[PDB]
Design a protein around this ligand. Structure first.
Ligand SMILES: Nc1ncnc2c1ncn2[C@@H]1O[C@H](COP(=O)(O)OP(=O)(O)NP(=O)(O)O)[C@@H](O)[C@H]1O
Ligand SMILES: Nc1ncnc2c1ncn2[C@@H]1O[C@H](COP(=O)(O)OP(=O)(O)NP(=O)(O)O)[C@@H](O)[C@H]1O
Ligand SMILES: Nc1ncnc2c1ncn2[C@@H]1O[C@H](COP(=O)(O)OP(=O)(O)NP(=O)(O)O)[C@@H](O)[C@H]1O
Ligand SMILES: Nc1ncnc2c1ncn2[C@@H]1O[C@H](COP(=O)(O)OP(=O)(O)NP(=O)(O)O)[C@@H](O)[C@H]1O
Ligand SMILES: Nc1ncnc2c1ncn2[C@@H]1O[C@H](COP(=O)(O)OP(=O)(O)NP(=O)(O)O)[C@@H](O)[C@H]1O
Ligand SMILES: [Mg+2]
Ligand SMILES: [Mg+2]
Ligand SMILES: [Mg+2]
Ligand SMILES: [Mg+2]
Ligand SMILES: [Mg+2]
Lengths: 470, 471, 464
């Protein structure tokens, strides 16, 4: 019988299984710069816009004018909401009994249903002991429940993985507790959200990554991804007809393609051909490059007889070039999502995934891979992902990150020593939903692209890289 | 000798070796959101539903009306219990320990209560009570409650998960019984555990045991309490591939765990699909737990193999449950399986795949999962088909990486074999407990109609390496 | 709308996405010797030099004369600026709150100051102040400086590098903006970093960015292509590469010790100077004398190239400094001499001590500078295994490289032979052969491929 109020924040409602309990107070706790103020403003803003519920923001430090100024770059009409008596900022820069009655006045005057208090810590630092803090928070919470308001209360922390608040009391008094974290690992920051406790209801458990973008907080609950993506038998072309034959008539549109192999095997070539065919069919494509600069890609592509500039000028090709270490993986994902949503491609390429794994948790990488994979299949975009293997010959593994099961189609490129010279080979290792050629065919790179020849039928141990002529 | 009172909480009595000591006080300690209040209510709720033992809940903060509303999420009709005078919520919250003890005592007498819950004592000692005060005052409360002869649950707060048991380093030593609820955050995922540290005068299970809070309240899964006592018959069940059945000595065993291991793309899913199809052809029910592919993909690929899961799902013989491994923790996944089984009640089940569920979990937490799902399948007499993808694509010297080979009864090893510069495939019945099996590493070819198993590579060596030599 | 003011500090405005918010206070916190003071003076100095905005520097310990003396090592004309009534240093050193305000207010007016630096606010409260008092007192100072309409910088002291952000656990929550300076000790080596933790109402780059302090102040360095060919100095290798190396490419020479990487990195260089072009060699393994002796035995006369003004050689042990400092040493020397071709021998040596993640940042930085400056770059990496190295690098920098030359030993008939292979060449055809070569007093000699053998890449072949 515990009902909830939508915050209007994308993903927070999902993690809360609907939103914050109505009539109750929720504690949002975090270190400096975690998004407590941003979240609290968000909560009020959506109240007034989407449900026409007036809201009150109580401030003990930040001036009203600064709060509006610091919220100006989220695209919200707060100034007008204030002018139209829909939002009231109460400056508060036997004090709690005074504050309580002052808030109560504003609630009744503006007929408020949502309240934000930011931050309660500042009040109790005055000179309150743990015994005093506990009784005083309980009063404020109880009275706020008496007026019949839904409240968001902000507290400060010092550590990321330590005391949830400051006095070790605020959490046990609050019905609902939210933790914002901003963790530093490998010189990079990662914002996350956790719902620790909602009394009398359910919620998602654990930390959920988030970003603060254009319209505010965006949460991507990886747990709230459903394994229900649609699947057709519609084919698309690789740009190499012999490969299309080997793949049983081309790749599926609804599929994830992995090209794996050592450096210089011809992965970038195969993605370039995959993108070319999109543009040749007058469809849009995006290439996310993390290894090469666009200028480099352009030269190399023109040396294969592929004109990327032409494709860009036609408005069919978008190339995004970035160093993996330039941001966190949650941010990388958001760039991929935002850039796809702007260009609405039918085909997408990542060159390479193995680059985005350098100097990252094996787990954090997997979370990234499931997300981009899941997004592509969800959005019905054909994805071609590249992976560079460390060992250049003999690698008995497809991925060092062990990601093979997520992909639908696996193209294995490899070097093969033939008569004191370095040759290459291509195999359609896996193809869900279709027959494929089982051959480890030779292929050569020319100035006009790849040429898949025939298997080395008179050789043994071809997969090792160092064969034996029978 | 100390007698025990059944709590009626699923799994708690097993870890307690019967229940909580009667006429004694049990400390329940934990950080915020561990489920201390839920445990307390459950204890009292079951007291009155099962044995008609009236209960008293002493609250120092939460209002009676909130406790009832917060309990509604479990479907306990506590409002009726309060009206019928079987549950009493004593409000000891601020006016805006001898006196409290006297109120509690006479409340017990009025309602003839046999069980009491005090939530939380920490709050009352965060007035001004010091180490010597808290100790003397808890002792007073505990001693008196033994005088009345009531079984009491007492709640305390903590800051850390693996630090002091309570706040003042005193409550654990004065209490006769100590339970620790933990909500540990490893990685970015939370795992609820319960531990019984100490039961004076009695025995109990030791260490941490996972638990979940569901629709009927707390549910504890102690693998330790699970016994090696599952049945074994000679009843056979068909794979769906007649040549494989011959290779297995006349089909799989019903009371068995089938493991298919192999590199990606070998055809593990194809074999799962056949195993399920067969049940439905014999008008038997089967569940598929897919953690890699979606219903749409699963059905498109099945139709490419000549399998209609839709017809089976229409006839109520097939239930496909697709979900990412990241959606929940393993303990929760285990529950979802058991629940969905207990609903659909199948003859066969499939997990495609176990290797997916080992993603981002410890080796022991996965084992504990494997022991659970296997043991559950075997003690419910349901044939189980499990898949495992291997990290190496040719020449894996190990069957599994997680060492789950001993738990499985039948092992099917799928591999790639390079023949004439082309990737062929081979199938082997590596192990078959209780039966003869073909020892051949026999080639197979995936077609539109399904798998077609052929002859062994009798003119080759080093076949298991995946890179053979022609003789 | 929140507006930012350029600091003019190299890279800080990039990481600040414009600069520090105008008319607000930014907290700069760090342990001792991080560079709080140097950062604050750099803020004021650049205010007068670039935007002609006067600045005030409040000090509670350091003397004005010492501050100017300490600023001397950056070439900052603070002497003139004080004389020209541009910079004024308010000495609040012992021989209160309301007092210091009025003084600064007067100075702001008297000197028409738009920038103020306070260093250090900790010291003031190091008289006495409970958490409540500190918070209220800082809140006032900020609230007032906001009224005056000044962009302020405030210094605070930390005890640990990854601990609390300030001292009293309060300063971060009052300030609108918080910058953290760190000086982390790891492997007996120190590394300086800057982080923008929080900018209320605006965006900023997230995380730690490395910085150095040169002779102009703080340098923060956060993270086309032609078909013009250049010669290797080995005709046969040029043919193997499809007509030589591209002038817009990174060349890696990978192989075991003694394979001939230094020879190839010598021929390249000699070829530049033979074309009357400048080149630099950054050595971290051998001395200039050793290099000269061995070059002479190979037939290459470096001494002439240095004298003819077409070759510089910078030799330094990797342990000399740190990666971030090493990178600056390259950058500086490149701009000074202005080469056509660069050469590092070796990158494997510069990877000693540092972390894999720490090294990867060096390579990208160095790689980017060459391509940015349009300089051909020849790099060497020594592999750990002398035979059977089925891995190009252990550092995984292959993707960053354009051209890969693999040198390996091969056992032929109880004898140790050598082979070279153009493993990779982006934007060009190359020879695929694993060709034998021999080192002589005339230099290398690329011969034929071992067509009659198998398993050559292994190093232990089989005569078929
Ligand atoms: N119906 C339900 N189903 C699942 N989980 C639930 C349900 N009801 C409550 N919970 C969970 O139980 C948590 C609170 O349990 P509760 O026993 O009140 O915690 P506690 O340990 O008493 N907290 P605290 O008072 O701060 O010490 C909620 O945050 C939910 O995660
Ligand atoms: N014009 C050309 N003619 C013939 N071969 C060429 C030509 N241009 C490039 N190549 C070959 O193509 C290779 C580069 O292929 P590419 O697609 O970049 O491989 P990759 O596997 O993506 N490399 P990497 O990302 O560095 O691991 C070169 O090493 C040459 O062997
Ligand atoms: N219609 C078809 N005709 C022929 N071969 C097919 C057909 N459909 C699928 N295949 C083959 O069957 C393979 C898929 O088998 P599958 O059972 O999905 O393998 P798996 O080992 O379960 N893969 P994974 O889940 O990634 O570990 C494809 O890679 C093809 O080689
Ligand atoms: N208008 C905006 N546009 C974009 N990002 C913003 C904006 N406002 C704030 N941010 C980001 O959010 C951070 C601070 O969010 P905010 O909610 O003010 O933090 P907080 O947790 O309330 N800080 P504190 O008061 O110290 O506890 C900034 O450092 C920015 O990274
Ligand atoms: N006069 C000479 N005649 C023949 N061979 C010579 C002569 N001088 C040097 N060498 C060879 O050249 C090798 C040194 O080549 P060099 O280019 O220094 O290798 P490297 O791979 O850079 N070594 P290192 O720096 O230790 O990793 C010696 O081991 C000899 O085999
Ligand atoms: Mg704030
Ligand atoms: Mg590439
Ligand atoms: Mg509770
Ligand atoms: Mg200083
Ligand atoms: Mg050398």
């Amino acid at each position: 019988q515990v009902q909830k109020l939508p915050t209007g924040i994308e993903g927070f409602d999902d993690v809360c299984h609907g939103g914050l309990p109505i009539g109750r107070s929720t504690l949002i706790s975090g270190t400096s710069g975690t998004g407590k103020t941003v979240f609290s403003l968000h909560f009020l803003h959506n109240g007034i816009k989407h449900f026409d519920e007036p809201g009150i923001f109580v401030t003990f430090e930040e001036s009203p004018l600064d709060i509006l100024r610091n919220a100006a770059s989220f695209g919200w009409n707060l100034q007008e909401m204030v002018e139209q008596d829909k939002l009231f900022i109460l400056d508060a820069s036997f004090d709690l009994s005074g504050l309580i009655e002052r808030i109560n006045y504003a609630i009744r005057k503006y007929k408020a249903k949502r309240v934000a208090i930011d931050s309660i810590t500042a009040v109790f630092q005055q000179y309150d002991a743990v015994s005093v803090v506990r009784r005083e928070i309980f009063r404020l919470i109880a009275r706020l429940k008496e007026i019949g308001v839904t409240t968001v209360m902000t507290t400060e922390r010092i550590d990321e993985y330590g005391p949830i608040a400051r006095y070790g009391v605020e959490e046990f008094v609050s019905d609902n507790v939210v933790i914002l974290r901003n963790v530093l690992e490998g010189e990079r920051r990662r914002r996350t959200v956790e719902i620790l406790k909602l009394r009398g209801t359910t919620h998602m458990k654990g930390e959920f990554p988030f970003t603060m973008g254009a319209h505010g907080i965006s949460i991507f609950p990886l747990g709230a991804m459903r394994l229900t993506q649609r699947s057709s038998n519609v084919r698309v072309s690789s740009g190499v007809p012999r490969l299309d034959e080997m793949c049983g008539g081309g790749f599926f549109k609804d599929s994830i393609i992995l090209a794996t192999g050592a450096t210089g095997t011809g992965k970038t070539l195969l993605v370039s051909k995959f993108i070319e065919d999109a543009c040749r069919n007058k469809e849009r494509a995006i290439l996310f490059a993390y290894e090469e600069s666009r200028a480099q890609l352009l030269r190399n592509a023109t040396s294969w007889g592929i004109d990327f500039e032409q494709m860009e000028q036609d408005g069919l090709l978008k190339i995004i070039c970035a160093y993996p270490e330039s941001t966190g993986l949650e941010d990388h994902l958001q760039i991929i999502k935002t850039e796809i949503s702007q260009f609405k491609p039918s085909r997408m390429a990542i060159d390479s995934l193995s680059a985005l794994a350098r100097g990252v948790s094996h787990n954090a990488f997997r979370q990234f891979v499931i997300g981009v994979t899941g997004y592509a299949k969800q959005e019905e975009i054909a994805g071609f992902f590249t992976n560079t293997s460390e060992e250049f010959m003999g690698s008995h593994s497809i991925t060092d990150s062990h990601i093979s099961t997520i992909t639908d189609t696996i193209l294995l490129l490899q070097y093969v020593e033939i008569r004191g010279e370095m040759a290459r080979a291509l195999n359609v290792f896996k193809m869900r939903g279709s027959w494929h050629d089982k051959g480890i065919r030779e292929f050569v790179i020319t100035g006009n692209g790849p040429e898949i020849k025939d298997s080395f039928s008179n050789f043994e141990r071809i997969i090792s890289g160092v064969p034996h002529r029978i």
